[PDB]
Short mmCIF file of C-alpha atoms in Angstrom, two decimals:
data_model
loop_
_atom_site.label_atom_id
_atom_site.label_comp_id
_atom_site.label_asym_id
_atom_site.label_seq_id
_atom_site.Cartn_x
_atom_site.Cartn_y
_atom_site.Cartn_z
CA UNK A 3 0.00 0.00 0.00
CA UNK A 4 1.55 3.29 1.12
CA UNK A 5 4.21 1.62 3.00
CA UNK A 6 6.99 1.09 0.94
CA UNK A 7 6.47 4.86 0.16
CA UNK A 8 6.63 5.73 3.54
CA UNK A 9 9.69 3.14 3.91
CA UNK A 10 11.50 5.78 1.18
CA UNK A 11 10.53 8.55 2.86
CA UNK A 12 12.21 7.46 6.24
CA UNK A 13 15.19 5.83 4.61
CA UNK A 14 15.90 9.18 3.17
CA UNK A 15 15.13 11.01 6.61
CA UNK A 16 17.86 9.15 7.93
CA UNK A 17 20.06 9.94 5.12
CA UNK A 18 20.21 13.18 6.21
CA UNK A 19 23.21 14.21 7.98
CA UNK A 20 24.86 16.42 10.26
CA UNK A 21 27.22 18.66 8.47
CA UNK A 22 29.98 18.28 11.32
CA UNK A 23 29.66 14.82 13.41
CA UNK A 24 27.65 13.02 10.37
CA UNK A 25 24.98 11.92 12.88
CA UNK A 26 21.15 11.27 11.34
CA UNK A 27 19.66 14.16 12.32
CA UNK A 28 16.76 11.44 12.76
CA UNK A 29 18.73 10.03 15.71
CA UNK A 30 16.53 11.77 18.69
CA UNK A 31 13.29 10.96 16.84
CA UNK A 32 13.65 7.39 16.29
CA UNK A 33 11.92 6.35 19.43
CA UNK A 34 9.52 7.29 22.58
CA UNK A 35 11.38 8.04 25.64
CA UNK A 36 9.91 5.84 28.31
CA UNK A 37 7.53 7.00 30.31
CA UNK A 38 8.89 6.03 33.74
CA UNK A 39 12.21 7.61 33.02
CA UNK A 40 10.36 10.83 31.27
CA UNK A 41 7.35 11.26 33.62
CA UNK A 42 6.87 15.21 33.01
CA UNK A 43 7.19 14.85 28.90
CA UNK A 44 3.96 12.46 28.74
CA UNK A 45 1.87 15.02 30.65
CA UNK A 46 2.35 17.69 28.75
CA UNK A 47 2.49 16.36 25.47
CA UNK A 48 -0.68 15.27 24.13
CA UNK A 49 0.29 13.17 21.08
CA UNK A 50 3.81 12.10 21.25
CA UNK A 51 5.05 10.38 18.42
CA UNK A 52 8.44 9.00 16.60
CA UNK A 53 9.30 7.02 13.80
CA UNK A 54 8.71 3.59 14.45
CA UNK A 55 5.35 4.60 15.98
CA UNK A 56 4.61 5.88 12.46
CA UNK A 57 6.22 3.30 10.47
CA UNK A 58 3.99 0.33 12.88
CA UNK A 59 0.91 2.58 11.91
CA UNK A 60 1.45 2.92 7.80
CA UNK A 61 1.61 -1.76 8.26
CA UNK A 62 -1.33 -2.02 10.32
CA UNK A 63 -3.70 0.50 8.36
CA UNK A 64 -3.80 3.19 11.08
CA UNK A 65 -2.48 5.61 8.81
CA UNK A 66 -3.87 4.99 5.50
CA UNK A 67 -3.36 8.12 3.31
CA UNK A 68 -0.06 10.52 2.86
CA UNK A 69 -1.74 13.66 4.68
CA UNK A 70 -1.53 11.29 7.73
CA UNK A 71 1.66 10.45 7.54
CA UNK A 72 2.58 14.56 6.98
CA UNK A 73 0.31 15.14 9.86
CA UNK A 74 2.11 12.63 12.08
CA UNK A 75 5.17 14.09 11.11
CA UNK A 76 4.55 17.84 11.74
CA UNK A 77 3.27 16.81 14.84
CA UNK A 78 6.64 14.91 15.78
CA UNK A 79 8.21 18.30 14.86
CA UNK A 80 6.01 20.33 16.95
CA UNK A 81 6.28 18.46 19.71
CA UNK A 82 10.37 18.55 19.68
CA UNK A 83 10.15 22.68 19.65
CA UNK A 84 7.77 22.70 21.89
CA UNK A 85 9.93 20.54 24.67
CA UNK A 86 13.12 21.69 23.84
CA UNK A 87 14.75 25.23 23.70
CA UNK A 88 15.30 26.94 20.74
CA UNK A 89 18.97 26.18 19.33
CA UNK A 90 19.51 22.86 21.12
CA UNK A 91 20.65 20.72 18.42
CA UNK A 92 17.09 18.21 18.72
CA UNK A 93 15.81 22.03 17.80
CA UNK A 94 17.75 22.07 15.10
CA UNK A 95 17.83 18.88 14.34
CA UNK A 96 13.43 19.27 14.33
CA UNK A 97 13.83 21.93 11.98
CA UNK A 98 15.99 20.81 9.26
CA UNK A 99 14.24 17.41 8.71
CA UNK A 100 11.13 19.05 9.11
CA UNK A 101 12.33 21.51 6.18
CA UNK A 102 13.03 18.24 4.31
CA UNK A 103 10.13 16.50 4.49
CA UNK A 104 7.99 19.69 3.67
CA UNK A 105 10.07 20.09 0.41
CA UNK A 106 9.95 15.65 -0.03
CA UNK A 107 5.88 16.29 -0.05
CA UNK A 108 5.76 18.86 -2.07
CA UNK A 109 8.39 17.34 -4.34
CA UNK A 110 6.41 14.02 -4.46
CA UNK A 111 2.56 13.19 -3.40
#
């Protein structure tokens, strides 16, 4: 369905590196932090969401159309500047992958 798409869209995410240390500048939004670890990030943020969460819901039909997936995404993005202070590097980090996959949508469906 729209999974292998998706699959491209995220192996390209994480082909986007740092321009000194080379890191994926999808390192930090890979995965949830756990909640017992993280206890004041899970009550403020409504929807928190990562990669893998997204990935698990383009297989299993939760997310069945593109404008989900952007949605998911911007909301991934959000959430990173809303928890973290402007200039950190997951700031940065949140708004250069978010200014890829803006232009990726635009550049594809």
């Amino acid at each position: 369905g729209i999974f292998p798409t998706v699959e491209k869209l995220v192996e390209e995410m994480r082909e986007q590196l740092d321009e000194v240390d080379s890191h994926p500048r999808t390192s930090i939004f890979e995965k949830l932090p756990s909640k017992r670890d993280y206890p004041d990030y899970f009550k403020v943020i409504e929807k928190p969401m990562a990669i893998d969460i997204i990935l698990k819901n383009c297989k299993n039909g939760t997310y069945k159309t593109l404008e989900e997936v952007r949605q998911a995404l911007q909301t991934m993005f959000e959430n990173a500047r809303f928890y973290n202070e402007e200039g950190s590097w997951v700031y940065v980090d949140a708004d250069k992958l978010n200014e890829f996959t803006d232009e990726w949508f635009k550049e594809h469906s």
